[PDB]
């Protein structure tokens, strides 16, 4: 600026850490999306040989999405939630870079490796840490809103070996407004707000996918999404009036009634679904899953109540290291 103090301007300019000086990353692009692009980085100085994730946030300046992600990540501190180590503000091009500890694995790749053909200690431990991390967020009135296997990172070799790191939270949603395999039925019937319950449904889906290796509500490419609802009912059955009294309050309930019939899904239930995928319906795992995958969101258990479930008191106990001291067979991330 021609009317900012010059001594102040050059001083800050002299002292400003620039991302290109501190870190080596050119050509190490590791993820790409409509929320900024991520790189596997190492420090140029030999201070430590650990890997970091550098995310360049899309667009110039500080957008609402940029703002709120920076705002919240700067406050949040919990072992199961991804940690902002540093924010670089590059003055020349007006790009923002966020530095994180690098997560070598994620549940999307872990599950896909197994599907290309999970120990039960590992499944329980994954679920527990997911629940621990979401519960933290929820206690601080932070919703995730885009929970799915690709957003559940898992740390590799290093001092946090096998710890879950929840990532990629939907920090900006205009007015908290949603207005599909992991989306709760209320969103599909036009729920006007994100809620703790919607995240929990998502965790139930992930737990079912961890037990079976198959997305429980897998569906082809399509607010209201008919075929995704058709799949929910093929697995769960069609909800009775008694199971979800407030379903009539949903904006798309009349559409649901026109499009679907109860007797279509008379054979269908979660018990029968899970039996096909070799999971016992009198196991603590199943009874927990069923509580997470409750259709009425006011009948869905909370993350805190899930952590208290006796499933986590049953042999085997959840472990901090999800890999339980065993060798990690899963391949290291491919560059994009």
């Amino acid at each position: 600026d021609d009317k900012m103090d010059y001594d102040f301007k050059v001083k800050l300019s002299s002292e400003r850490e620039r991302v290109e000086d501190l870190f080596e990353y050119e050509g190490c692009k590791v993820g790409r999306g409509t929320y900024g692009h991520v790189y596997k980085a190492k420090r140029k100085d030999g201070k430590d040989d650990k890997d970091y994730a550098l995310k360049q946030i899309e667009g110039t300046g500080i957008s609402m999405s940029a703002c709120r992600e920076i705002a919240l990540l700067r406050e949040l501190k919990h072992p199961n939630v991804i940690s902002l180590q540093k924010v670089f503000l590059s003055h020349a091009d007006r790009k923002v870079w966020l530095l994180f500890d690098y997560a070598e694995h994620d549940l999307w790749h872990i599950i896909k490796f197994h599907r290309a053909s999970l120990p039960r200690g590992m499944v329980k431990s994954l679920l527990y840490q997911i629940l621990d991390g979401i519960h933290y967020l929820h206690a601080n009135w932070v919703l995730h809103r885009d929970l799915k296997p690709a957003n559940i990172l898992v740390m590799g070799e290093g001092p946090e070996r096998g710890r879950v790191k929840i990532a990629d939270m939907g920090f900006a949603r205009l007015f908290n407004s949603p207005l599909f395999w992991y989306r709760a039925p209320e969103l599909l019937l036009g729920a006007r707000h994100y809620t703790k319950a919607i995240d929990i449904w998502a965790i139930g889906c992930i737990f079912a996918e961890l037990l079976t290796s198959e997305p429980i509500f897998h569906c082809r490419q399509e607010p209201y999404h008919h075929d995704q609802l058709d799949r929910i009912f093929n697995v769960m059955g069609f909800p009775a009036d008694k199971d979800w009294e407030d379903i009539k309050k949903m904006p798309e309930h009349s559409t649901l009634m026109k499009d679907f019939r109860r007797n279509t899904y008379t054979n269908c239930s979660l018990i029968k679904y899970m039996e096909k995928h070799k999971v016992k319906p009198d196991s603590k795992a199943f009874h927990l899953l069923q509580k997470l995958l409750t259709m009425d969101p006011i009948k869905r258990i909370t993350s805190e109540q899930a952590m208290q479930d006796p499933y986590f008191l049953e042999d085997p106990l959840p472990t901090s290291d999800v890999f339980a001291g065993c060798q990690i067979p899963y391949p290291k991330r491919e560059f994009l």
């Binding site: 102040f8 957008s63 920076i70 919240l72 009135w141």
Partner: protein
Amino acid sequence: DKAMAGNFWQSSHYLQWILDKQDLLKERQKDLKFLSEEEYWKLQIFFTNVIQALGEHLKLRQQVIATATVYFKRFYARYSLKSIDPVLMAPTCVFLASKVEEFGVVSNTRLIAAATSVLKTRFSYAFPKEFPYRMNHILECEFYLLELMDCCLIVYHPYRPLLQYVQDMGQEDMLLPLAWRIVNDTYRTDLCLLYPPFMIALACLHVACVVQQKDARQWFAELSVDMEKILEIIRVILKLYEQWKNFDERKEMATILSKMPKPKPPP
């Protein structure tokens, strides 16, 4: 409920942005070469009124105006008034604070129109010339502001806890309007850099009770908190209202603004 509501004791506000008074006044001596102590507090009052005026124009909530007011104070806590023109910083602070909320978006043209309109209609006693900055200047300022604050954006204010206390007394009708305005008035002072929000809220509520002549001693006694520090906060509040009496913002601010140190140009 709002994001990070119960997290104050582990927050960046508490861990980094509750400053020592000794450290504050030592960095202020830079600007005290040009302005007196009296003129420095008078300037702080002025720019609090400017940030309130901007917020009221953009129809933002009091809590967003507060966050903006704090961002401003944090900046000039560390840096001189010469470093970035406070006429540019004020709306830049309002702009950044509005974006911290996910409900509604303040647009570019609407920011510049708001700054321009407010200085012209409400502060023409201080500013003869039109608001000279444009959006490129705001966007540049935003970056410097964000750097100094160490990306600490989430800010806690006395409003939330105030509300809880008046509801606890069962005297929301009598005391809340008055206590609330006194909390707004505390932003005319350094209190928000020196004490946690809840202690400011208690102090405000005490002044409200004394002004309205309700006996709150048995309620105040039943609170587990350092009463010395509350009394310290009441003294600043009491002094603020005697500063208010003795100060004619409109008759004095043009001259005081001329005394502010100007930036160095480029070579």
